Design an enzyme around this catalytic site. Sequence first.
Site, mmCIF file in Angstrom:
data_model
loop_
_atom_site.group_PDB
_atom_site.id
_atom_site.type_symbol
_atom_site.label_atom_id
_atom_site.label_comp_id
_atom_site.label_asym_id
_atom_site.label_seq_id
_atom_site.Cartn_x
_atom_site.Cartn_y
_atom_site.Cartn_z
ATOM 1 N N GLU B 232 0.923 -1.265 0.129
ATOM 2 C CA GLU B 232 -0.303 -0.091 -0.028
ATOM 3 C C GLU B 232 0.808 1.160 -0.163
ATOM 4 O O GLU B 232 0.273 2.219 -0.585
ATOM 5 C CB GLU B 232 -1.146 0.212 1.321
ATOM 6 N N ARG B 310 -8.699 2.811 13.058
ATOM 7 C CA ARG B 310 -9.395 1.724 12.947
ATOM 8 C C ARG B 310 -9.459 0.562 14.199
ATOM 9 O O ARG B 310 -10.570 0.192 14.483
ATOM 10 C CB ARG B 310 -9.112 0.815 11.692
ATOM 11 N N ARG B 342 -3.566 -6.363 5.987
ATOM 12 C CA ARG B 342 -5.029 -6.802 5.942
ATOM 13 C C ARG B 342 -5.695 -6.829 7.497
ATOM 14 O O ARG B 342 -5.217 -7.780 8.315
ATOM 15 C CB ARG B 342 -4.963 -8.362 5.636
ATOM 16 N N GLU B 691 -10.703 -8.140 4.085
ATOM 17 C CA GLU B 691 -10.230 -8.297 5.573
ATOM 18 C C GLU B 691 -10.896 -8.683 6.474
ATOM 19 O O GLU B 691 -10.564 -9.165 7.421
ATOM 20 C CB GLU B 691 -9.862 -6.788 5.700
HETATM 21 N N1 LIG Z 1 -4.877 -13.186 -3.199
HETATM 22 C C1 LIG Z 1 -4.807 -12.038 -2.314
HETATM 23 N N2 LIG Z 1 -5.929 -11.972 -1.479
HETATM 24 C C2 LIG Z 1 -5.969 -10.707 -0.792
HETATM 25 C C3 LIG Z 1 -4.844 -9.834 -0.830
HETATM 26 C C4 LIG Z 1 -3.636 -10.100 -1.719
HETATM 27 O O1 LIG Z 1 -2.598 -9.348 -1.440
HETATM 28 N N3 LIG Z 1 -3.720 -11.306 -2.162
HETATM 29 N N4 LIG Z 1 -4.983 -8.853 0.007
HETATM 30 C C5 LIG Z 1 -6.168 -8.430 1.021
HETATM 31 C C6 LIG Z 1 -6.234 -7.132 1.512
HETATM 32 S S1 LIG Z 1 -4.818 -6.334 2.564
HETATM 33 C C7 LIG Z 1 -7.316 -6.228 1.102
HETATM 34 S S2 LIG Z 1 -7.335 -4.718 1.752
HETATM 35 C C8 LIG Z 1 -8.129 -6.540 -0.310
HETATM 36 C C9 LIG Z 1 -7.982 -5.482 -1.144
HETATM 37 O O2 LIG Z 1 -8.637 -6.103 -2.574
HETATM 38 P P1 LIG Z 1 -10.258 -5.514 -2.498
HETATM 39 O O3 LIG Z 1 -10.566 -4.211 -2.095
HETATM 40 O O4 LIG Z 1 -10.457 -5.755 -4.086
HETATM 41 O O5 LIG Z 1 -10.821 -6.592 -1.652
HETATM 42 O O6 LIG Z 1 -7.736 -7.893 -0.653
HETATM 43 C C10 LIG Z 1 -7.316 -9.008 0.254
HETATM 44 N N5 LIG Z 1 -7.174 -10.440 -0.012
HETATM 45 O O1 MOS Z 2 -6.384 -2.391 3.015
HETATM 46 MO MO1 MOS Z 2 -5.390 -4.240 2.439
HETATM 47 O O2 MOS Z 2 -4.008 -3.321 1.626
HETATM 48 S S1 MOS Z 2 -4.253 -3.682 4.489
#
Ligand SMILES: Nc1nc2c(c(=O)[nH]1)N[C@H]1C(S)=C(S)[C@@H](COP(=O)(O)O)O[C@H]1N2
Ligand code: MOS
Lengths: 151, 755, 51, 164, 164, 334
Positions: B232, B310, B342, B691
């Site tokens: 991020e 948060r 996450r 998350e």
């Molecule tokens: N396979 C996979 N799933 C994942 C992630 C990832 O890096 N790889 N990141 C997580 C995090 S930290 C977030 S915030 C969300 C972001 O994507 P979205 O807003 O499309 O869910 O995916 C989640 N699931």
């Molecule tokens: O908001 Mo997921 O990149 S911690």
Amino acid sequence: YTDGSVLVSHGGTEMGQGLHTKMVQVASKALKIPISKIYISETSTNTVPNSSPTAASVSTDIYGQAVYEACQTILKRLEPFKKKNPDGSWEDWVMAAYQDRVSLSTTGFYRTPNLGYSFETNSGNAFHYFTYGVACSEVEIDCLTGDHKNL
Amino acid sequence: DTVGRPLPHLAAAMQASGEAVYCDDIPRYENELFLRLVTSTRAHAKIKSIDVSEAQKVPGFVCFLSADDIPGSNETGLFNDETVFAKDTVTCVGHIIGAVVADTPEHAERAAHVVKVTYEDLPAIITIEDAIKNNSFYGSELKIEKGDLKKGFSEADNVVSGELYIGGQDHFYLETHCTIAIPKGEEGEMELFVSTQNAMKTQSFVAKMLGVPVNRILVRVKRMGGGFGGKETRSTLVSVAVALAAYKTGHPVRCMLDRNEDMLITGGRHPFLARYKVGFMKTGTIVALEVDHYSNAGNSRDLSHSIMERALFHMDNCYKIPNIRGTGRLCKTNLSSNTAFRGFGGPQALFIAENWMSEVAVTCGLPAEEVRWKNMYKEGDLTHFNQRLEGFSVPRCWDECLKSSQYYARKSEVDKFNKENCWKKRGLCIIPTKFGISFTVPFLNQAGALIHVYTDGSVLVSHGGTEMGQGLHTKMVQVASKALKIPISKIYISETSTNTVPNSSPTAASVSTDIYGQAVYEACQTILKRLEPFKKKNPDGSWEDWVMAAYQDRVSLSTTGFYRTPNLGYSFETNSGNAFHYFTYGVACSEVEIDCLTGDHKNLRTDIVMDVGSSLNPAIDIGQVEGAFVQGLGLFTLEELHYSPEGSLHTRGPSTYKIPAFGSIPTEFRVSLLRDCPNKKAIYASKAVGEPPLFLGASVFFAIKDAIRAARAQHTNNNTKELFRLDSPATPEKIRNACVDKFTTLCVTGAPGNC
Amino acid sequence: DTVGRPLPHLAAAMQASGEAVYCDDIPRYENELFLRLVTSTRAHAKIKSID
Amino acid sequence: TADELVFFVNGKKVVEKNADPETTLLAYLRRKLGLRGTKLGCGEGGCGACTVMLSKYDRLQDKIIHFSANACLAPICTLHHVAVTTVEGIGSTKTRLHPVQERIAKSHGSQCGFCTPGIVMSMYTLLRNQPEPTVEEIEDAFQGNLCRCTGYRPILQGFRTFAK
Amino acid sequence: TADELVFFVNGKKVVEKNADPETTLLAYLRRKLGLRGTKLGCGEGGCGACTVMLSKYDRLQDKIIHFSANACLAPICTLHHVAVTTVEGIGSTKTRLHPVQERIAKSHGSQCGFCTPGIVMSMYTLLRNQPEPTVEEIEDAFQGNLCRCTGYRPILQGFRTFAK
Amino acid sequence: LFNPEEFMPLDPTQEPIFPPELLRLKDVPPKQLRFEGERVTWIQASTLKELLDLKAQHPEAKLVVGNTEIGIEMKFKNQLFPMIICPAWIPELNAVEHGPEGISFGAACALSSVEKTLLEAVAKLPTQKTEVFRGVLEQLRWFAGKQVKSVASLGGNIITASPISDLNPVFMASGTKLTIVSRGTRRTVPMDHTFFPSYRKTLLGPEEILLSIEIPYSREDEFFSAFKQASRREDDIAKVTCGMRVLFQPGSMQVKELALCYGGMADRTISALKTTQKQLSKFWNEKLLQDVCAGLAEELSLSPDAPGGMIEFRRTLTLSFFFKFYLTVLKKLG
Ligand SMILES: Nc1nc2c(c(=O)[nH]1)N[C@H]1C(S)=C(S)[C@@H](COP(=O)(O)O)O[C@H]1N2
Ligand code: MOS
Ligand SMILES: Cc1cc2nc3c(=O)[nH]c(=O)nc-3n(C[C@H](O)[C@H](O)[C@H](O)COP(=O)(O)OP(=O)(O)OC[C@H]3O[C@@H](n4cnc5c(N)ncnc54)[C@H](O)[C@@H]3O)c2cc1C
Ligand code: MOS
Ligand code: FES
Ligand code: FES
Ligand code: FES
Ligand code: FES
């Protein structure tokens, strides 16, 4: 972008004729910001699709219009922030717009009106207007060799 | 119409065949160089010299870069409190001092190792207790308070106070940080290929360092081999360095981090320390709660403030608490700056909540499910931050999970097991969760898309979101296809780029499907309105017919779409305004068996019920529940980072840092998505899933704690209402040590003991 | 507002310096290959064989 | 005065006339041969992202043998007369996917996709040794492969179809 | 068995240990040294897009001489102990333009820009031999440079400023 | 979520062929090969004789088989070994030999080959003869992955001499025999406390190479266990791992021999010699449990600042592992 720099993309290509130069001049005039804040990088099918070839001498006319329209959209969206900070800078207005979640990306489009000549009826406009000119040239020929000099 | 169908990840076949291209798989330019970071070996020190004499003797060595080489600005980071390259003083082990450039990555590595730094040490602050003791914080206290605490504590039958610690976490994305920077040699133009969730900040930060307008910098993101929040912001540590090398050399340059560099330099989840006091009735009903949270933020602010925000938003979990005060402080320490992971402060605060709630049930001598249930919010209650819970589905998740997991029958089997077994014990726990959906910073809740329909009828979709394995592009294609009423085969998404959608928020906060879904939907609505006259004229024609007629009539087949989440804006001054758009809910039941003699354990069975509204893609959403739960299982039970007393990370690879493995997952592992619960507030009635499920991993931690309680009843004492402290992660060390018996006390030797 | 003014071509300085990049000036990938067209030497003929 | 190093990659002969002893198979595949399906995940043997199959005629057993190995730790100089099979050696979307590749993709066993080649090669290697493995052999095949995205459940479910 | 070829490009030593007799200076500059300011316009000596300056000490004349050449036709094998100057050798927008570069740009003598480096190198060479040339000498310097865009007027007009 | 009925069936005969060209090359007689790098010369030895000569000629030359340790040392510990010899081709270092006293494995034998061989031995032979074999197998259970085990050599683990080697404690406790050679010299020694004099060091000469390792059959009245800690937090310290052996006077529960050997309790694999010596002639009962635990608590005590921390946990494991052994021996004694 959030620093106030502007990236312009249009369907036209640069081949030496100075189209990007003219488009930057148009954008600068329409946005009311210096040319140094605006940039054109390239022409690409993932930014502007279905473009006509850069041809028929109309690229300034038609992309100039598209650029102008997109600029007008930007100005409309920035206007509330100008009013809130009338003594502020372009950069401050853009950042305020961003933080208020106003989109700073827009398309612009132009369609030349009233064209449609028919070979069947010999009517309807074939052209939008005409460009005119006159030239006067003087030469000297060598009657013995076929060489000549453009005087 | 594939919305709601289990369509595989669009790139899954290419990923299985090794055809999917990640950043380092991009071919190298003939003249492409390689960068290796040079990094501090001291927690806190003045830099007295940097000697590159031996590095210059390495074959293929090009140059050493340091702060002196930067043409624009050495000031960077989300809050402008970092250096690109440390100048006079280093402030953590792993703090970036400079970089070597060489002709091969092997040569860059060799040269970097032989760069010699001389330091003069300064007093360092490593632990949260160091930081509290020294008053070393970023900013002032954060606080949410509702009701009357003095009154609440006066009405309480029982009061329990305590201290709890939760360790941090390394993202362990299988693909580490990676950037390629290509200098064009014209006008400061640079094109970067980056493994990042945040192309906008990458673009801006590179631009700022170079001292050139943002419009000169193009950042492209095809995909990441995992992000999990660790990309991020902290991806800019590598990107900006590599952009500098490109600028300086005029050559393309790349860097991909080795695992040990990545774990050291790039930050992880925030460790938290909590001091808490709860007041409750003999019935288990909560009447007062006070929690002071402290995060270990490391050596810059980065996202630490929003993470603590948060955390405070989630200190209630699923429980109605009439008198409450939560505070948070960010500890400024000589560790790599911690960042998004996450859950983003949520798992920490939720774990703190479940810990005191576990103690309430023990103190009252009541079954834990009953205390949880009795304290649960009801539909339409306000949270401690005064937001109304509309469509509060936890009760449904709870009831269905209790039934399908056969909780009560299995509870009786666990008890039978503990009666029959002396040196092994089982535990079982059922845990709810809620997770607020939206960036807590209102302005990040915006999304753009750009859609082109080409004259063959094929559609190219571009949106501000990035793919990191979560199937975001997959969902966006499913959405676009449903919206336009054409097959998915006609739609393609290639990549995320700053020259198609500008000023994008990081792909984060689990909201990407929600906000890019709306932006794509809106763009699709514009296309439909423009094509409508041609459909009207030719209603039995094809998509392709309509598109060609529109093209030939000079109607534009390209448009932006944009979405701004409405009605957001919580005030810490009025304790009012919506912090979130809605909440995602879930419940998990887990059973474990511990080996009281060794501290090892087996995850026996886990049942999850998750409210994801009307899923856009059940296969992808089930996959997100499972992956997030297992990362939480890692956080609470396996994953442990360990530092020397001088603040140097010991655990720098998979040999010393243990993420869950194939053999780590619950033997019986069931996930269900709740049925007939459409969400009015998001795209096609779906809910964010990224998350919210991760905290459900704690169900394993609290089953382990249940099992320890049984071991302690067997060997330690006779006090059935004993509260003992169990910090996270519950590793074999902590589990074994908590099973006090004739061996821990040395009573077995003949000495007397507390056994 | 420069409209109506003789502003030099934006790229002219870089064109004079040899910094403006045209297609073949883009660096080659390490694995990049080169193509050469094979064309008819006859105005109108059947192709009988290619060796 | 160096001997030529001769090995095979995906059925094709590689003749390396200037082998550096320090060169890892992973570096060679990625940066000399341009086969980038095989990944770097850790460089210390823990993660399996770099897993390939090695095959040789074992002169002591009088037998062709096939086993998995971590490319990140295999010196090319150990590989004289050894055959390497990478993910690109067993199937592709441009030709035909191997059943191993098809099933992991279709079972939702690939999210980010970065660990997928290593897991595919671990499963591939098992099937090449034992065409009819048990369910237990299947789980044990992956002690050396880490996946951060999936929680493993789908990968095992899709591969359980090879068992009996 | 083969000798080393040693020359200089923009002040920097080039040691070619394996010179191919067929290699043109244009190919060497562009595809070995990565100096792409010098252009291919025809490969037959007629357009001057590939114009560079060469310098050498003349033993007979007892001085350093400077002249223009078509890089497309100069075998690198003729260049032993010769110094090459290209467009990148005289000025840059990243540092400072040479006056020849500034003037052609500001005088509107560059449209597409493809002929511009060659014309810059033709004018630069003239100035290196004659710091104060005449209007006549200026036009003659360009008999070997073609421009398809400008009609030549602005180029001569801008360079007239260097006379007499 | 998916439909397996639609999957392509597997066709075991349609797999990529083993390269025929490579198969033809197998007839070619092995010969020594020399590779030269920027920093390293590598010699691939084809014969034991060649290996012993090379080592006599270059005693500082580093052996590499699987490279699972040397690769880490070079990459992460900055180590550079300008000459490497790879003996992997040598038949003597790959031989699996069944003898009167135990099973011998050449030092280059991969841990996968050891595991296969031992698993076969355990399936075929009486429980009473395979106690040490099963100890070895338990340590190999959740040890790395298939990838590492297929190339990591048995001798490589032994000579690496990590304080946390899971195999060295089993080999020490069982007095596993090590045949060690140089040009001229040949000697066999049972592994005992003296084999590891200091951190990462063994009792070998600079020229000597470990040729083979013989893992003993267990005898009548002889029992063995091995255990290991299920967490590792530092590179090569502070992970408790052990081999435990007891031999009883014939048909008795009277201790004739006892060996408790531990990794992760010091900078090398160690034997609780003082504690075990005191139990000779004692009977396998609660009193012995108490005295051994007391001995272990003292002999293996860790300073509060001992490298690797986990001070209480590690002490507790040393005792808890003995307790498990104590109860297991009781069950085995019937
Ligand atoms: N396979 C996979 N799933 C994942 C992630 C990832 O890096 N790889 N990141 C997580 C995090 S930290 C977030 S915030 C969300 C972001 O994507 P979205 O807003 O499309 O869910 O995916 C989640 N699931
Ligand atoms: O908001 Mo997921 O990149 S911690
Ligand atoms: C991911 C992974 C997980 C691991 N897990 C464990 C574990 O759980 N428990 C455990 O105990 N170990 C573990 N190991 C260590 C592993 O068992 C050893 O690294 C391996 O056995 C070393 O053998 P090698 O052939 O690769 O040695 P190399 O790296 O080639 O050499 C190792 C050392 O032995 C010397 N040497 C090798 N052969 C001889 C010879 N015959 N004569 C004299 N000297 C010789 C070499 O010079 C070198 O010093 C793990 C390793 C990895 C990479
Ligand atoms: O229309 Mo100009 O390209 S002939
Ligand atoms: S890259 Fe992780 S095991 Fe090889
Ligand atoms: S799919 Fe992302 S690591 Fe496995
Ligand atoms: S390319 Fe035309 S003269 Fe050289
Ligand atoms: S400016 Fe175009 S050919 Fe001269």
